[PDB]
């Protein structure tokens, strides 16, 4: 038992690896990437929407290390993590593996709410989502995925090898966070806010339990927390919003928002990115009675 | 157990908590951390400087976290991770945890060099540095000191149980990474740079191996090497320079220098950062010869 063929003819998963001209005899790289062909075919519809130049051959091909004409001296690094590419007034707007991440947060309403308001920390585990290789590859197979005279019978065990040893981290149930909030800090105008904080987060956890891009990035078991809960260590007990946001203006911390104005471009924030029609913005007592 | 006693009668280590106005019940909150009064006051000459009210009280006395008229509204927040602070026209300049450890990186030759060119990433292993309680700590023991009824002897209980239960992360050896290392990947107007590498590094660690401020803070095995390997998870075998830096500037990336800009930027800033004689900027023909 190996990996599901494709329809394609692509390999089912393929190891990716810092293809170069120059020699790299002590394999001075990232780790390499494994790319699961399979999932992204049988997802994305054109095979064209990656393979921008309508061949379907490795990217590597063009873009390597350094760069080189075929490639218009775009880098792999460049061509694989681009983020602000500029569309292409005829022919096909070129896609790197993070801008079509990005998009897919942006564009999928269920997605769109918590990523209006995240800010991803683009850390090492971040990096590794990717970058994420079998302990079992030797130095040798390295040097020859570098070189490319790896055989792609090896290649492809390494990648099913990877891809069978992958396990999926579990987010942690809702049920270990608080039923309800009454968020009461600045209670004056109006009554406290009784913020239905694990409903919140349950509905927003069922609508994305079974997507495959979400689970492979949502990987700590408390990351979903930071969602609103950021710039502070994972944990079960997170500190207060008005530990870090003053109710007064904070002139030495310009881009920190007031308390009130850091729940409501929270609070807002998510409920515009993913077109919640309840409640609206303009709505001044659903989410605090006014006060008697 | 108990720690040495202090000269100046501050208890030898202390738990500092959380303190302010608003009930807390559910700890929300950044795990405490616990100061080592010994080694500081054995360091840091004048009391005033940290006491910069004179009287020797707890900040939270008037730095509590939502901030109160007796601190001037300067919250526990600011007053503890403050950088910006301005100098103090009458009396004293105040100091924050975070301003004095970043002025010794800035005014010890022997961090300046480093610190000259390292950008810190404040993560969560940055703050478990000071955020850093025992996990015997109870609940109901966190309740006790944010509300300020624990018990002086419990708290120096669990403040000495931390320290005591604290661990010094070893950097790697410089003998598992190159010992030299060749410069050629823009060979032309010079011959390579043969870049003593373990001499730098084995150099750099000698005069910081005792120092109790940076032992706590180069807190991952590999992380010295990220002094110029940056931006990249820690690794015995980094990217090349010239796999994100291209030769010429990158227009996608304005704000990357090209990789000759980013050798001359590192090499020649840690040497203007830590005074070092020669080479100078302008003594090039010292790092690469030229060309024959
Ligand atoms: C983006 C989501 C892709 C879609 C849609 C398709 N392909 Fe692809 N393919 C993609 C990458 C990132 C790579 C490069 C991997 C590498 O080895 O460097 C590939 C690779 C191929 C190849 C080359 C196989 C190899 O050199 O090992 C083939 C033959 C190929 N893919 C073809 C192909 C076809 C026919 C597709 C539509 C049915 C198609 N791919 C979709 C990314 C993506
Ligand atoms: C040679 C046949 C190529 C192959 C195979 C791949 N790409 Fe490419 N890429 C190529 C060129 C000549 C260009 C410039 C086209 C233009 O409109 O100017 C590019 C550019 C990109 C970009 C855009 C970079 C930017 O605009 O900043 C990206 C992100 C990119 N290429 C990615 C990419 C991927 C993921 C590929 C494999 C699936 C791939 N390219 C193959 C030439 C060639
Ligand atoms: C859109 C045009 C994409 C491009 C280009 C790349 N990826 Fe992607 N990826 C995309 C989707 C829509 C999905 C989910 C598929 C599904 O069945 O829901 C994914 C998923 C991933 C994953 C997670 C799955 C896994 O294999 O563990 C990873 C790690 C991943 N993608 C990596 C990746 C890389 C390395 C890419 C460039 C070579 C890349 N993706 C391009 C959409 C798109
Ligand atoms: C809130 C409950 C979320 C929902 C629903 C979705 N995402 Fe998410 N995502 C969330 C957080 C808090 C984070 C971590 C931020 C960080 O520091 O990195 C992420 C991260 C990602 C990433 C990586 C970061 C990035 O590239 O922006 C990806 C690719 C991602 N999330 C994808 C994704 C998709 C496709 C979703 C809808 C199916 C989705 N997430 C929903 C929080 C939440
Ligand atoms: C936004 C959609 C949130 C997500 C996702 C999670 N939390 Fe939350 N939480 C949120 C807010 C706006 C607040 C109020 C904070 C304030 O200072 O006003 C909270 C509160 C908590 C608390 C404190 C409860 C108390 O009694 O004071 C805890 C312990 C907490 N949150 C935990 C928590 C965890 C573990 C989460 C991930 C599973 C999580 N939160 C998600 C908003 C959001
Ligand atoms: C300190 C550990 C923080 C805690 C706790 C919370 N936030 Fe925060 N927030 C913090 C910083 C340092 C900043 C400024 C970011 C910058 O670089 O300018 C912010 C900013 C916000 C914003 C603005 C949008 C954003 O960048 O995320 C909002 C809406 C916001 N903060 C809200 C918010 C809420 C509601 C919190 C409790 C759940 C909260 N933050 C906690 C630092 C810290
Ligand atoms: C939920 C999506 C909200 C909407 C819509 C509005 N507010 Fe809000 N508001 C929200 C929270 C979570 C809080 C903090 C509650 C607390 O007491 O700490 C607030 C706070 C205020 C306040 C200050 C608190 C008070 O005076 O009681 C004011 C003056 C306020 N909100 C004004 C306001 C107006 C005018 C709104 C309609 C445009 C409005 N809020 C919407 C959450 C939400
Ligand atoms: C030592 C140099 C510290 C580093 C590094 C960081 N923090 Fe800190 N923080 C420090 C002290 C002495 C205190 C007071 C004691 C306490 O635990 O309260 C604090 C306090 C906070 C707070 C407010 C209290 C709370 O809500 O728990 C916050 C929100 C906080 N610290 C956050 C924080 C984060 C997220 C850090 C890494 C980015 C961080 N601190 C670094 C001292 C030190
Ligand atoms: C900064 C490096 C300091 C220097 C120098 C000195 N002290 Fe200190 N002291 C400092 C901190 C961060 C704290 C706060 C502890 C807390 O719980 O908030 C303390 C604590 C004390 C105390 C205890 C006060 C109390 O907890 O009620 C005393 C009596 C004290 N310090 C005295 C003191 C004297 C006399 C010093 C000079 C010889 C001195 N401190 C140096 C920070 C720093
Ligand atoms: C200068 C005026 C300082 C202020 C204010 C604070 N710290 Fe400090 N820190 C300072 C020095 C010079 C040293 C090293 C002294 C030596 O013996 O060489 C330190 C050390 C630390 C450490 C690491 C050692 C340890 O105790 O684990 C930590 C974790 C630390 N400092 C914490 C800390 C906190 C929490 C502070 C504010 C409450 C704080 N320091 C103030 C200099 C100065
Ligand atoms: C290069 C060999 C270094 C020397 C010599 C010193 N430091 Fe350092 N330090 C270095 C790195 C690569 C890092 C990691 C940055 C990160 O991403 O966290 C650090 C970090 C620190 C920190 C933490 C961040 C900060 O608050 O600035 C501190 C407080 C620190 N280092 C202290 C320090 C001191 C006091 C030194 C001289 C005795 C010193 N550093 C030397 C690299 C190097
Ligand atoms: C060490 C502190 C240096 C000093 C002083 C100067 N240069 Fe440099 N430069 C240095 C390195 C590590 C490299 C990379 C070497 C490689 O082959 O990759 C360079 C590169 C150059 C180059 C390009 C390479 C070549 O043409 O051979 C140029 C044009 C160059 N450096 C010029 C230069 C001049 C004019 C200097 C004195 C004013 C100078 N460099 C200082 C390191 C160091
Ligand atoms: C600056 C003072 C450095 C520190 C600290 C470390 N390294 Fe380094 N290293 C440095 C440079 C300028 C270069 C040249 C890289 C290039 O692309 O031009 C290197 C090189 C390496 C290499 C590759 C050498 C080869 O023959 O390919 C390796 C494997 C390497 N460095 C590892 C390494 C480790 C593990 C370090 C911490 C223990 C480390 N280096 C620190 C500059 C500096
Ligand atoms: C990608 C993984 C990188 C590798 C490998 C190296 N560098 Fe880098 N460098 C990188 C980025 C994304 C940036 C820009 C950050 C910004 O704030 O714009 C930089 C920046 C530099 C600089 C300028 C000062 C700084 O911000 O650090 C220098 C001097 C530099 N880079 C040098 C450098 C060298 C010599 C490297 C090999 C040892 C190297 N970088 C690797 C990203 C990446």
Same mark, same amino acid.
């Given at each position: 038992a190996a990996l599901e063929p494709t329809d394609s003819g692509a390999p089912s998963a393929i190891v990716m690896f810092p293809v170069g001209?120059?020699?790299?005899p002590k394999g001075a790289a990232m780790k390499p990437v494994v790319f699961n062909h399979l999932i992204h075919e049988k997802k994305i519809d054109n095979c064209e929407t990656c393979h921008h130049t309508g061949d379907?051959? $490795?990217?590597?091909?063009?873009?390597?290390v350094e760069g080189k004409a075929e490639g218009n001296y775009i880098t792999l690094d460049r061509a694989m993590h681009a983020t602000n590419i500029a569309k292409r007034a005829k022919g096909n707007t070129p896609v790197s593996c993070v801008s079509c991440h990005e998009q897919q947060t942006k564009e999928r309403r269920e997605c769109a709410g918590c990523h209006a308001i995240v800010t991803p920390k683009r850390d090492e585990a971040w990096c590794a989502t990717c970058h994420n290789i079998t302990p079992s590859m030797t130095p040798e197979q390295m040097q020859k995925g570098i070189n490319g005279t790896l055989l792609p019978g090896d290649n492809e065990a390494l990648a099913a090898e990877t891809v069978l040893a992958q396990k999926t981290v579990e987010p942690v $149930?809702?049920?270990?966070?608080?039923?309800?909030?009454?968020?009461?800090?600045?209670a004056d105008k109006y009554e406290p806010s009784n913020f239905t904080h694990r409903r919140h987060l349950t509905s927003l956890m069922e609508r994305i339990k079974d997507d495959k891009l979400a689970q492979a990035f949502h990987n700590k078991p408390e990351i979903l927390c930071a969602t609103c809960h950021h710039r502070s260590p994972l944990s079960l007990t997170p500190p207060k919003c008005g530990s870090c946001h003053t109710k007064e203006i904070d002139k030495a911390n310009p881009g920190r928002p007031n308390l009130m104005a850091a729940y409501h471009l929270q609070c807002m924030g998510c409920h515009k990115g993913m077109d919640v029609a309840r409640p609206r913005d303009t709505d001044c007592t659903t989410c605090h009675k006014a006060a008697p």
């Open positions: 001209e120059k020699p790299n379907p051959v $490795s990217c590597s091909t063009c873009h390597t $149930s809702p049920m270990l966070a608080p039923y309800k909030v009454v968020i009461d800090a600045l």
